[PDB]
């Protein structure tokens, strides 16, 4: 692959919502970019992303 910021390797990221009292089980023998931090969320509604230079 073409170099982007010096790198020809790529990093592909994935996400999920982990319900209260569920568990997430990772198994990897290589190439794993593991979590250290995660984020607590409660969502009571929606909007969108605005594009603005202000």
């Amino acid at each position: 692959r073409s170099k982007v910021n010096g790198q020809s390797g790529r990093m592909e990221f994935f996400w999920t919502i982990l319900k209260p009292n569920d568990a997430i089980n990772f198994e990897s023998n290589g190439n794993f970019i593991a979590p250290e931090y995660a984020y607590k969320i409660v969502k009571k509604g929606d909007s969108t992303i605005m594009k603005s230079e202000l």
Partner: protein, 175 residues
Amino acid sequence: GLFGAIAGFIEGGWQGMVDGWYGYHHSNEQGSGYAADKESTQKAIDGVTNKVNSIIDKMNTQFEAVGREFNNLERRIENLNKKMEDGFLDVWTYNAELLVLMENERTLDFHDSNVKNLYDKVRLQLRDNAKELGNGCFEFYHKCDNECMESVRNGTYDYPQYSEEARLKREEISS
């Protein structure tokens, strides 16, 4: 206009009548002067207020978040959104524009009617106690002091009182 009064058989309005939309101008021995008719001005200001408030009130306003959330391989949905977005703007732009054009005609005809109705109100009070000059004025066949003019302006003109004095002046004009 539709009702023939404003910019019709009454040519031009009155800079000198500052205190209302429609009213009177009297002229007698004591002096001349302007007076706003408050009943018909207040009615009209009630109607036009109500008109304006409804055009604004009746609009239903919901929360909407509108952005560009589709990527470079979702151009077909992005175009569905554009057709939708653009479509509603065409609708609202046409309705707003015509709504304003159409209610602007009705508001001016309303005023025309209001003025014609006031003229007819004085007409019906005075009957033959006054000549009808046809430019919106009445020439009285009797002497009409300030308290008489007030009686015309507040809808309590006493035709009987002046009726005799008037017909003697009409009989007299037949010479």
